[PDB]
Amino acid sequence: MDYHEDDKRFRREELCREAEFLKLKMPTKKVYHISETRGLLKTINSVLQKITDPIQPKVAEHRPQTTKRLSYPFSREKQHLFDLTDRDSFFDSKTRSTIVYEILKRTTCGITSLLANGVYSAAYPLHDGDYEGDNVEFNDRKLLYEEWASYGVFYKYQPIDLVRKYFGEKVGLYFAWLGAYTQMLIPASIVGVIVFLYGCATVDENIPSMEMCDQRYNITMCPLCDKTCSYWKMSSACATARASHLFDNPATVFFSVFMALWAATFMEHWKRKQMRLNYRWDLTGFEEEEEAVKDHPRAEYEARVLEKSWRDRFPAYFTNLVSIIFMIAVTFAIVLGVIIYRISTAAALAMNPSVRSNIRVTVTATAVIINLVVIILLDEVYGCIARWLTKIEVPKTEKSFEERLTFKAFLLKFVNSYTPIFYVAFFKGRFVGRPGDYVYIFRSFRMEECAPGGCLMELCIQLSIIMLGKQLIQNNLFEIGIPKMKKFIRYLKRKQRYEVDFNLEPFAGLTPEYMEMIIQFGFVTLFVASFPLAPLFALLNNIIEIRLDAKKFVTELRRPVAIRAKDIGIWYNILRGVGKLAVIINAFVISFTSDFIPRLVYLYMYSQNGTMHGFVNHTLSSFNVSDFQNGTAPNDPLDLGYEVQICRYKDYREPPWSEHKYDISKDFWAVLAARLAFVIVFQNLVMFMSDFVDWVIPDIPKDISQQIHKEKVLMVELFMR
Amino acid sequence: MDYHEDDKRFRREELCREAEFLKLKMPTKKVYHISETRGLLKTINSVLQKITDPIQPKVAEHRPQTTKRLSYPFSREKQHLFDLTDRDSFFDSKTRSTIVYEILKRTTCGITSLLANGVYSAAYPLHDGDYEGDNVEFNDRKLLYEEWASYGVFYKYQPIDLVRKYFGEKVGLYFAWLGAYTQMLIPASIVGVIVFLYGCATVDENIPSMEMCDQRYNITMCPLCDKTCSYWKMSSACATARASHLFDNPATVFFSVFMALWAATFMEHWKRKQMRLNYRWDLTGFEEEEEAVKDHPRAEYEARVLEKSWRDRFPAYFTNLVSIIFMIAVTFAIVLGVIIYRISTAAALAMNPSVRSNIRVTVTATAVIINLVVIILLDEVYGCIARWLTKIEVPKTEKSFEERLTFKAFLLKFVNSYTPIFYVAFFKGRFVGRPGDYVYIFRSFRMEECAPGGCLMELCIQLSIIMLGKQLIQNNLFEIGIPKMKKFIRYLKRKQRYEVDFNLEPFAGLTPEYMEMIIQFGFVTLFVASFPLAPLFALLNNIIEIRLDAKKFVTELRRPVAIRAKDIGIWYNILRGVGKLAVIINAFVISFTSDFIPRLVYLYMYSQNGTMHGFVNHTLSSFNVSDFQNGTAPNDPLDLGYEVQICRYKDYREPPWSEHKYDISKDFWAVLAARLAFVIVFQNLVMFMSDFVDWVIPDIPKDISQQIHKEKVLMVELFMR
Ligand SMILES: N#Cc1c(C(F)(F)F)cc(O)n2c1nc1ccccc12
Ligand SMILES: N#Cc1c(C(F)(F)F)cc(O)n2c1nc1ccccc12
Ligand SMILES: [Ca+2]
Ligand SMILES: [Ca+2]
Ligand SMILES: [Ca+2]
Ligand SMILES: [Ca+2]
Ligand SMILES: [Ca+2]
Ligand SMILES: [Ca+2]
């Protein structure tokens, strides 16, 4: 109701008696530090905490606690450790909670140790009040709800200063990074939409697509499966080629280069914005060299080692390596099983009406749904096992534990999210053989063939499904519904502020949010040469996500402790690494799965006339149907208006009427050399461009540096006077 | 003789009267700062300078001047700004000279401005005394001469602390970097010698070299020139192939990878050593943001702009770009002229005894000598023009001027030093055509053909000549003789210390020394896949160079002002960039000029038997001598024991008895694809390995950080007590 209580100790109301004694001595050991009050609740009982005014300077002066001073050159209050202040209430409640948390966790007895032991089942600060109500006291929580956490203010700049003041520099840094990411995604989305519009405009005049779509010509392709399917006409995939043209053209290559430059520019812009926010909030980077607080399990391990009698973690490290390798192998095996799923389901379904008319979408849709559900469960399981792996290695400090767990979880999430996309982009229909000599996995299954029109369309469909159904629909819906579902379950199985805050969901951390954003960034950067509009989908998802996260923080979760951070941490390194890998991934996508290199090679060496006419005939090689290997020919030749004597396919192999029939032709080697040369040139040039963009743009803006120098001069002048 | 004089103003003894007045007011404006004495010399007159004891704390306290304090935990005197001291003589004479230089250059009137105007023709501090003599006072100069500057102490560690104390942190940092470079080059030299020994041992069992050396077989090669030369037997270049085998093999590829890793490790080791030296000497990185001293020409330009009425340097920038492009074009044109030199000289010489028996060495030796002399003169001219280019742009501060001049000079020196080597390695005999269709430069000259045995041997010979005759013999001899020559010229056209120091050569700077070392590093790293023993030659040159530079500093040059530096500066960035480019250069050398890829391709696709037999026949293509283009056949067919009907050559072209005779074969495209794939794989893997080496090794050693933390704790404890 009405008080100034600064923290909330919560314990299970009642060996049971032995555990009760532990919580009777900790408050006694902090009686002279913090004055508490006991609340005899009705359900589980709860304990209040209060910090007195004199204790504030004693603990606020233990470490440098900058506070805004009186002088304000250029309307900027000076931040000084301890110069002069008054009114005995200038501390923000977040700062009071942070000081109280320092007092609790610095005790010898530690709040973390007893929380782990289970004597205390909860501990949190309180919100300033209710975010919604009738004529409420006009707290900062309601201000954030109305001004920042509403879905109707999705277009306006977020009050980042108020967010940092209420929740701390950590959540504030996360939201500032999210806003900068969305703002940078805006122009990239515009350019991608322009590229897509250019492709749509040019699709009608595309010579290869027109040649593929010509129904006057009769081009018969070999079957994509042994006996389930038969010969198909090249014109049957006219829509696929026209759709594909919108995703591979010179505009797409230009957009890939533009997105590499955009990633570099976004990195530089985030560096500058982070420096600006540090100058605005706090620039005291001096901290203990991991000597502030030590991990209690680490302390117990050290005590055990000393009682018995670094580098003793080797069995843990080997276990971590083995577990990670096993996880990656399991993910690859699940991908292989999904591959085997599509082959068996397609063959069985065709043997059965409407089922044989929708074999493509029915097999692909069910496979996609199965993969998405399986990898959701895999993400949960791998997060838990990464928790365990980081626990067993026993990091010395909490910061190292968070660092290593974040690295492991990001690696596992990267593998699970990008394995099927990498497979479809590179290795889907590449390792098969000629129609007379196929390759079978487990000598029972023909592995995989690209859909009529190439595997680029499949990659585009997969990317669209992943970034719309999963990242935009399923993920956000799960985020909204999981806290509500758990609250409803808890309910199934006036009021004081501490009680209502206790009913709120505990804060989990910024790791899942950063993980989602980094995965989306990887989607935007790694796969953009073959798929424009990825920045547009990311922009829409981020527009929803800013308000979703703000609402979750304001209304659902408990108030975090609001510890200090000046950097996003390992996430910047992860972003830089993903951006660096995006250059190689984009180069390989353009060279091997884009079909752009073969068109250039044909135009500049085999065109003769100098145009693109005859490219489809050039890329298609003839095969004699009589050379099928006794059980691979179509079970029922359709015989639409003829009998197939020679079926066409695209492998760059010499014709049956040659001495070296079905062997790799010179055109294959020339096109492969062109692909490799383009990969080399693209990678080197894009890396040089990114390095140039990094080098030209200064890390710290000159204005911030000059303002810092002027502030230091003024502060030293005041100090000596 | 005997005094404590701390600086030496020197002026031309006598508008002349107007200039004399300028030097009469500067000492008056510093009478209260520095007490001078006038020396009425006999030749040109000279002025002494002295700084009093009270002025030392006034100027030493203007900026943080750390001095070793009394406390010494772990035998380490504490470095503090101003805590307590005594004896009134604890300042080193180098520190006294630095303080005096600060006093002189901070005056408004500035010593730099009047030195530029010409009123003062010289200004320097004095050496502690004579480095050699009979029962001399045992100064630090003689200690450095005996202990560090002698050629007989080439094997011992240099007294880097004494060098830094006498000459300052700048020369000390240069010499520490040189010593670390030599120490790192030692193991690399050992591994390279081992690789060379492996090649020498294996050369007898090399199947391709044995096949080339077989005199039983009769393989006739097409002439390498139109009419000057005739058909030659493949066995005539047996020595060339055997010598080449020592420079291209799996050991050479392993050594290229090892040298990439070694460059990364050397960068990390230098970073750690630099941090250690900073901790030992000075860690006060706080300095003015280019606000300490402004360039006098920049001030004059700003005053002119303000009187008339950033980004006004655009005509200067355009001039700089045009001049740099013109310089690079001139260097490339000189390379082209050297190319045209060899063609014309070879043809003319053969038309003439002994001349026709030594056409190869005579043409190549004279061409190499001409190129070396021309590029020496080019280096001098380009250094002067880079001086002018940096002057015209008017850098705001001296540090920016030095930075930009160093960048321009390094770029020009890189171009001049590496243009011929790059040409010989990549573009020498690559752009010629088939024997029936050659390509002529200016339609008068057949451009260039690789010597019998490949262009790898020519590259190895060029590298050996460059790193032995030029970098080791010519460069060191010129360094030793130029100061002696100038001193002898000055002489042709008891004594006080200032006079003898005046006779000494003025200090030029560390830029030429760093430039030589960086060029040698580029030689060691960029071209090492095709040439082992490069680290060995670099190690020998550095062993000579350490003592040569020490002797030059101790005995020849005047004592530098000994300004402070904590980093080598732009040279670290240049080294990192050269190392990064070395990966790509090594990959291209291995793939295109090493002949390693074709051997693998033949062994794994065309070998059949699985061995290397028949590789030489595979790489050689037949040509019908009747297809010469009417003036390209040999003028005099030698007819040793037969008449040539078909001459062989290596171009991967189909034989005359085929329908597509002389066209590019499938083997050419396959080998090109293999080369490009190897380039991609090598570049990516080596970049990842270098990044891993950088990431694993911490930049600052933990010992230095913990010692700094302990020192800070002790200092704060003493400060509060
Ligand atoms: N989404 C999606 C997928 C699509 C398509 F985009 F067209 F719908 C096609 C496809 O072959 N695969 C997809 N996911 C896969 C996972 C493992 C193996 C193959 C996989
Ligand atoms: N040194 C050296 C050179 C050698 C060799 F090593 F064999 F001696 C061979 C060679 O063709 N060239 C050399 N320098 C060149 C500069 C420009 C053009 C060609 C050049
Ligand atoms: Ca989401
Ligand atoms: Ca989220
Ligand atoms: Ca930068
Ligand atoms: Ca030298
Ligand atoms: Ca030198
Ligand atoms: Ca490092």
Numbering used by the authors:
A (entry chain B), B (entry chain A): 117 to 130, 165 to 259, 267 to 466, 483 to 525, 528 to 668, 683 to 910
Quote the study that presented this structure, word for word:
TMEM16A, a calcium-activated chloride channel involved in multiple cellular processes, is a proposed target for diseases such as hypertension, asthma, and cystic fibrosis. The protein is broadly expressed and mediates vital physiological functions including fluid secretion, smooth muscle contraction, and the control of electrical signaling in certain neurons. TMEM16A is a homodimer with each subunit containing an ion conduction pore. Both pores act independently and are activated by the binding of two Ca2+ ions from the cytoplasm to a conserved site situated in the proximity of the ion conduction path.
With an overall resolution of 2.85 Å, the final map shows well-defined density for the entire protein, including two Ca2+ ions bound at the canonical transmembrane site and at an additional site near the dimer interface that was originally identified in the structures of TMEM16K30 and F31 and whose involvement in channel activation has recently been demonstrated in TMEM16A29. Non-protein density, which is not present in any of the previous maps of TMEM16A, is found at the extracellular end of the hourglass-shaped pore of each subunit. The location of the site within the transmembrane electric field, with a fractional voltage drop of ~0.2 as estimated from Poisson-Boltzmann calculations, is consistent with the voltage dependence and the perceived mechanism of block obtained from functional experiments. The binding of the blocker stabilizes an open-like conformation of the channel that involves a rearrangement of several pore helices. A much more extended transition is found in α3, where the rearrangement of the helix changes its tilt and results in a clockwise rotation of about 60° around its axis and an upward shift of about 6 Å from the Ca2+-free to the Ca2+-bound state. The outward movement of α4 widens the outer pore entrance, while the more extended conformational change of α3 relocates Tyr 514 away from the pore and projects the adjacent Arg 515 towards the pore lumen, creating a site that accommodates the blocker.
